[PDB]
Write a protein that binds this ligand. Structure first.
Ligand SMILES: NC(=O)c1ccc[n+]([C@@H]2O[C@H](COP(=O)([O-])OP(=O)(O)OC[C@H]3O[C@@H](n4cnc5c(N)ncnc54)[C@H](OP(=O)(O)O)[C@@H]3O)[C@@H](O)[C@H]2O)c1
Ligand SMILES: NC(=O)c1ccc[n+]([C@@H]2O[C@H](COP(=O)([O-])OP(=O)(O)OC[C@H]3O[C@@H](n4cnc5c(N)ncnc54)[C@H](OP(=O)(O)O)[C@@H]3O)[C@@H](O)[C@H]2O)c1
Ligand SMILES: Nc1nc2c(c(=O)[nH]1)N[C@@H](CNc1ccc(C(=O)N[C@@H](CCC(=O)O)C(=O)O)cc1)CN2
Ligand SMILES: Nc1nc2c(c(=O)[nH]1)N[C@@H](CNc1ccc(C(=O)N[C@@H](CCC(=O)O)C(=O)O)cc1)CN2
Ligand SMILES: O=c1ccn([C@H]2C[C@H](O)[C@@H](COP(=O)(O)O)O2)c(=O)[nH]1
Ligand SMILES: O=c1ccn([C@H]2C[C@H](O)[C@@H](COP(=O)(O)O)O2)c(=O)[nH]1
Lengths: 494, 495
């Protein structure tokens, strides 16, 4: 219909996943050389086989993948060939899938694939819809030529984690920080075990490490939470205490499918996405969200809360002309939720989408919910209250201004919410997703969240996950939470 | 008038200047000792302390400099030169009254004043309405005990420049070193240092000059961004006009203890800043009110041809429609023409925030905006500084501005000064002291043609900011005028 935003033909193009991300698992000697420790084989099997979910039996619907060179495949004892419970992807210029099957002594057909190519070719195959998102983690298991390719671009930028066992008994060398070979990645240890002793009868000495690429973007957030606790002003309102500072700014890359969902505490993505779509549709009835099991508006849509605003005539969960209402119908007269507001008010989102397509250098491509005429008719004044877009080199960037920032729960939710908005607007306009800039006004931690924030500040952030689209829609307003999926999200535990 | 904002009777309090700023002039030996016969150094001293900065006009009681000196330095000045001529002479003494100093002369009663106290007491005097703004620069000329007071808090935070002459020829002049406790957070750096010079004194004495200034990290933030836009911004051309740009940035400026962040590496048109800001706060929309004060910044956007190009064929010339201040004091009101009676129409966001600040300063919704999509097409030009939010802590008011399009050459310094002035005014309206300005930038750009003079500006090391004082006050916020306030100690570099 005429009021919706039609997606262009290029809709899938700038979000298509080029290479699937992966982790590396390697054992080396004390000099880093890669040429019988059962505890290491126990760790290898568990780390490469188990899914992150509670009690999930690996199957073609949901399992890990192991990627290896043809010589590593040859050297697996035939008892464990193919590695059971994993997809086995084997790199070879010589051997087809059929030849690998012919080397066994039909059970295994869905679990073995040959790739005539290197690790990059294997990551390109694993990014296709038959394997993403069904493969949960891709593990690269060598050998030396495959590790070399994993540790240089373009593959190295998709390496989430390196699991290295060192055993006191061609070198595996992680690029050093600041060096050309590192390509701007700063490798750091998340964990390193004590020196351990094998029960193998030889008293073999070994230790494990897990390295991860330093995530300076989530570090920004961490630094700000640490500063608010160490130096923020205490205020009490009802008497709820907060610690606060005023004025800050963070930036996050959305390029090549990255999604900045924080890793040091899990973000409720399903909630982020349902809510953002609800904003984009211009919705105002919060029951639409609570009926999908997203309860973030229940406190502010209650009879009691609405009455406390003077909104006595609103039905329960009708929030008035909040948010998406102003995005799609700024200044329209509001009566009740779900009336026909087609063509009323200013549709700021449609207008920006049209400008992005025809004049992407325009400096007025902004939208707002802060409408002081409508403020008193809203359950709450918007907190994320405007955003502005910018284009460079065919990439779309967005800056968000947020007046009141709960660092514990609101801010990580809003980062994700605006990352997703930017990605969707780039898909609507022929552009690739660029950077998200988040400006913060009053940035606060509730005083009862101080000890848990301190516990969270103990954690070293991990690589962010990625966003892919399983399918597309003819109109921007018809997107659904099931159309897209977050892959490679590995947050720390609660 | 019921629609205006009445100033509280604390209006003058949070803005009264406590101590007047000053600069220091000293001669030392190669060891830093202060104990000479170098006529070029006397000439320097005489010219620096006597001359005014604009027109080289005769100093008089309406406009001159001051010299501040301890009693023994006064005793040491040769009677041909006592008191110094063309300067107000301020003498620190627990023992000598002004009359006792007059008695020790062999016309001068308005040019000599004794202060029973130290440098801090002299700077409090010099801050009073009889001496600020009429004294253009205050110079501290020693001796040891007065220099030691100049170089520690509280006086050192008011020290704008140290002019040291060193001469190859007891007590030591030592400027606190960077990062030390004695430095109190200030980083002294050389703006200039001469080559080694030889005196025409009969002895070929060797000497040289330095001028030291307190590093101004706030203005450096701006210059760093200008440098980054030129070295790394994206080139774009619009009608063919070129810019270099980046997206998303943020700067912060202290407004504390009368400081005013008017940039020093290129002079800002303060009078135009002030006139326009007051014009916004009154809710005005006629640009002729400004061009009739010689502030022409809206002339291009208010022309007949320009209005016609936006479709605004029924608006008389210079009527901008419901821009800026009109949304600040009348958000959402229907606009007909400039100067109609809009009282009580639309939302008065400035009034509302003033009442919230007085009663619930912790509120997190004290924001105003001019970005009104319904009214955008009636405006001559959508606002560029479009919203601001206030925050209070420790009795201090801070403000953050959001600006969508940021011309770093001319616009940005102008709007830093604009929102610094707004914040100071709103603090005076609400019983608060001015705190900090936070400036958030969207599309931040340098026009292609300004690259070379921006690069000439980046050669300059920023100097300490000036200060804002209020000569008088008003009953209503809307009645303030540019002549009610004065910028003092502004010493920008040349064009
Ligand atoms: N400590 C450890 O964790 C560790 C690590 C690595 C290796 N190892 C040991 O070393 C041995 C593995 O040897 P390796 O490291 O020499 O070899 P590998 O890397 O496992 O296998 C190399 C083979 O992989 C295929 N391959 C690699 N890149 C390719 C590309 N771009 N295109 C097509 N095919 C490609 C080629 O097979 P085709 O010849 O069929 O084309 C190549 O000969 C094993 O016996 C193992 O025990 C141990
Ligand atoms: N090369 C140079 O630049 C340079 C620099 C400094 C000095 N000098 C020379 O060194 C001599 C200066 O002597 P100095 O440095 O020992 O003296 P000074 O600082 O010039 O004078 C000290 C006198 O100032 C008054 N004073 C200072 N602080 C005071 C306070 N808090 N309250 C009240 N009164 C205060 C007192 O006068 P009462 O005794 O009347 O109470 C005190 O005795 C002169 O001969 C001068 O020409 C040269
Ligand atoms: N960290 C770790 N990483 C590694 C190796 C290691 O040595 N340890 N060695 C290389 C991989 N080589 C093999 C060899 C044999 C098997 C194998 O056969 N594994 C069975 C378990 C067999 C068993 O329990 O002994 C499995 O089910 O995973 C797996 C990888 C590269 N990466
Ligand atoms: N840099 C510089 N700074 C200084 C001194 C200096 O030594 N040079 N010396 C101390 C000031 N002492 C004096 C002593 C005498 C005079 C004096 O008499 N000046 C006449 C000019 C005299 C002349 O031209 O011969 C005048 O009108 O300024 C000025 C400062 C502290 N500051
Ligand atoms: O998207 C949002 C909305 C709200 N908040 C937080 C900010 C405040 O701590 C609180 C709302 O209180 P006020 O700012 O409205 O008073 O919720 C967020 O973090 N994110
Ligand atoms: O307060 C203001 C108003 C305007 N501009 C500059 C920004 C742009 O260079 C130009 C406005 O052009 P658009 O952004 O509206 O296209 O003027 C400023 O820097 N500050």
């Amino acid at each position: 219909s005429l009021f919706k935003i039609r997606m262009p033909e290029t809709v899938a193009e700038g979000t298509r996943l080029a290479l699937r991300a992966f982790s590396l698992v390697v054992a080396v000697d004390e000099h880093g050389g890669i040429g019988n420790v059962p505890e290491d084989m126990k760790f290898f099997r568990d780390l490469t086989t188990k899914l992150r979910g509670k009690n999930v039996k690996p199957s073609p619907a949901k399992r890990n993948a192991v990627v290896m060179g043809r010589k590593t495949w040859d050297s697996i004892p035939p008892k464990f060939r193919p590695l059971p419970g994993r997809l086995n992807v084997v790199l070879s210029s010589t051997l087809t899938t059929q030849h690998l099957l012919d080397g066994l002594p039909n059970l295994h057909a869905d679990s073995i694939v040959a790739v005539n190519g290197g690790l990059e070719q294997a990551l390109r195959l694993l990014a296709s819809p038959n394997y993403t998102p069904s493969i949960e983690t891709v593990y690269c298991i060598g050998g030396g030529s495959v590790y070399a390719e994993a540790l240089r671009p373009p593959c190295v930028h998709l390496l989430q984690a390196i699991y290295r066992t060192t055993i006191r008994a061609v070198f595996f060398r992680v690029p050093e920080s600041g060096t050309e070979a590192a390509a701007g990645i700063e490798w750091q240890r998340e964990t390193i075990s004590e020196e351990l002793t094998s029960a193998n009868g030889n008293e073999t000495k070994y230790y494990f490490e897990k390295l991860i690429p330093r995530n300076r973007e989530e570090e920004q957030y961490l630094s700000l939470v640490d500063r608010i606790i160490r130096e923020g002003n205490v205020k009490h309102d009802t008497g709820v205490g907060t610690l606060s500072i005023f004025g800050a700014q963070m930036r996050f890359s959305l390029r090549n499918n990255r999604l900045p969902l924080l890793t040091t505490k899990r973000v409720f993505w399903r909630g982020v996405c349902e809510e953002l779509l609800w904003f984009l549709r211009g919705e105002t009835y919060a029951k639409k969200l609570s009926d999908k099991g997203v309860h973030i508006w229940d406190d502010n849509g209650s009879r009691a809360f609405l009455d406390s605003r003077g909104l006595t005539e609103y039905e329960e969960m009708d929030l008035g002309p909040v948010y998406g209402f102003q995005w799609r119908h700024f200044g329209a007269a509001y009566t009740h939720h779900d009336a026909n507001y087609d063509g009323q008010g200013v549709d700021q989102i449609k207008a920006i989408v049209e400008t992005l397509k025809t004049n992407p250098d325009d400096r007025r491509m902004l939208f707002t919910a802060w409408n002081p005429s409508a403020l008193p008719r809203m359950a709450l004044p918007p907190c994320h209250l405007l955003a502005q877009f910018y284009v460079s080199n065919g990439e779309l960037s967005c800056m968000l201004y947020q007046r009141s920032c709960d660092m514990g729960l609101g801010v990580p939710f809003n980062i994700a919410s605006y990352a997703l908005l930017t990605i969707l607007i780039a898909k609507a306009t022929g552009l690739r997703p660029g950077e998200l800039v988040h400006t913060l006004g009053d940035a606060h931690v509730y005083s009862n969240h101080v000890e848990p924030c301190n516990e969270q500040l103990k954690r070293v952030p991990r690589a962010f996950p990625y966003l892919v689209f399983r399918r597309e829609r003819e109109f921007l307003e018809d997107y659904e939470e099931g159309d897209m999926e977050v892959i490679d999200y590995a947050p720390y535990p609660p």
